[PDB]
Specification:
The PDB classes it as immune system. The entry lists the keywords HIV-1 GP120, clade A/E CF01, viral protein, Immune system. The assembly is monomeric. The chain has a single domain, classed as Beta Complex (HIV Envelope Protein Gp120, Chain G), CATH 2.170.40.20. It contains five helices and 24 strands. The termini are close together. The structure holds 2-acetamido-2-deoxy-beta-D-glucopyranose (NAG) (10 copies).
Length: about 350
């Protein structure tokens, strides 16, 4: 027997002590080695209540990633709280590794295995683990990259679909590659996506949200203003902060002649708004050479337009900005409990 509890977790990794890649360096001194022989214990005929939108593993991971980024990235200047802070800005090696989150003695992690679990409510196929699976801490908006996939149907996760200010996490069951390159203006870049695979998946997503919104017409529109970090698909590739225009991916016409390669325009930005919320940071100009990152789109973050309770349409725009939802999309099936 066990009871819902909140304890400070520890982390584990297969990080290499000789690497200079910042994720390895941070995990080498802040996490322990992953258990070589992990044991997973299935709990026969037991049912447990999960709630992904009220999970303290979320905020613990958020804390870890903030600390990771603050020890790893070296901006030449940070304008924070009215306070300029200058320091050397060497280029770094950057490629996220999976991090495992683990319970201390006297606690354990309950794992939801219901394939179609949406993130809240009862789960009937429950297991017990000491650590979660290896989660890559990918920092991005609009598109969730390099995560895990939904096992059966595409899942729609939200704390309250009725409230349109609550973000909608869409868990894909089929990854779609995004291939972003700054070839050898040095900040010019672009991302290539297979149109036929994206639009097929995009159309499957519309039918799933049709299921949740009373078979209403689902419409995609690009962000309605805001900072470039959420108006564009922002992510970090090999240390460089990429901003990509995704209006070509949320086009309701193709859900005809759009079957080849979609090419998103991208820019590498030196001056950015921190996702930690601490203000602005300036980095050095990009490195020479082919900057390339091939990633899997495994989810989409959407925010639905409000005020359409009188009309026949529901309109959605790529959302994000709160990185907790990024960690939320991977920690949704885990919950901490105390042994009794
Ligand atoms: C419960 O989940 C496990 C692991 O995901 C999988 O074998 C199957 O879906 C379920 N197994 C049983 C015995 O219910
Ligand atoms: C998730 O499932 C629960 C039932 O356990 C339900 O109350 C809730 O509305 C569902 N949420 C979504 C987004 O489907
Ligand atoms: C991309 O997705 C495929 C499965 O769809 C997976 O096998 C592959 O390892 C993924 N690549 C990365 C970098 O996660
Ligand atoms: C993904 O889920 C949709 C339903 O949401 C289903 O129609 C489709 O066949 C699934 N695709 C795969 C590859 O599982
Ligand atoms: C969901 O959101 C609607 C509209 O914002 C609100 O009326 C309702 O109280 C919310 N439901 C829950 C369970 O929070
Ligand atoms: C990614 O794009 C570059 C240039 O567009 C190309 O050279 C490379 O082969 C592509 N990689 C994949 C895996 O599609
Ligand atoms: C797009 O993916 C489809 C499979 O859905 C495949 O027929 C084709 O090879 C791909 N085309 C491009 C340009 O990537
Ligand atoms: C939503 O649409 C499908 C159309 O096939 C239907 O089966 C389902 O019952 C509909 N639900 C409502 C509430 O209209
Ligand atoms: C994205 O590109 C479209 C044209 O395809 C343009 O109208 C729009 O202004 C761009 N987005 C931003 C945030 O500049
Ligand atoms: C996703 O994983 C691939 C393979 O590990 C890596 O090359 C790529 O940089 C990753 N994408 C991001 C945004 O970290």
């Amino acid at each position: 027997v066990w009871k819902d509890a909140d304890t400070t977790l520890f982390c584990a990794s297969d990080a290499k002590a000789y690497e200079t890649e910042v994720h390895n360096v941070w995990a080498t001194h802040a996490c322990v080695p992953t258990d070589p022989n992990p044991q997973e214990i299935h709990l026969e005929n037991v049912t447990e209540n999960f709630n992904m939108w009220k999970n303290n593993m979320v905020e613990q991971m958020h804390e870890d990633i903030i600390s990771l980024w603050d020890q790893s990235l070296q901006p030449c200047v940070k304008l924070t709280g009215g306070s300029v802070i200058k320091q050397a800005c060497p280029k770094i090696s950057f490629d996220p590794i999976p991090i495992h989150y683990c319970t201390p003695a006297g606690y354990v992690i309950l794992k939801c295995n219901d394939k179609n679990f949406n993130g809240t409510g009862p789960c009937k196929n429950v297991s017990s683990v000491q650590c979660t699976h290896g989660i890559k801490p990918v920092v991005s908006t609009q598109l969730l990259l390099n995560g895990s996939l939904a096992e059966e149907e595409i899942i729609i996760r939200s704390e309250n679909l009725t409230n349109n200010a609550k973000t909608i996490i869409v868990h894909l069951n089929k990854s779609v590659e995004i291939n972003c390159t700054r070839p050898s203006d040095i900040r010019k870049a672009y991302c290539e996506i297979n149109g036929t695979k994206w639009n097929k998946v995009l159309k499957q997503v519309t039918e799933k949200l049709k299921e949740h919104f009373n078979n209403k017409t689902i419409i995609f529109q690009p962000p309605s203003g805001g900072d470039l970090e959420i108006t564009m698909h922002s992510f970090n590739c090999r240390g460089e902060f990429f901003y990509c225009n995704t209006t070509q991916l949320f086009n309701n016409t193709c859900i005809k002649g759009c079957n080849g390669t979609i090419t998103l325009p991208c820019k590498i930005k030196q001056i950015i708004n921190m996702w930690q919320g601490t203000g602005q940071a300036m980095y050095a100009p990009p490195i020479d050479g082919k900057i390339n990152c091939v990633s899997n789109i495994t989810g989409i973050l959407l925010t639905r337009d409000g005020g359409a309770n009188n009309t026949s349409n529901e309109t959605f725009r790529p959302g994000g900005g709160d990185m907790r939802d990024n960690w939320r999309s991977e920690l949704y099936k885990y919950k901490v409990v105390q042994i009794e």
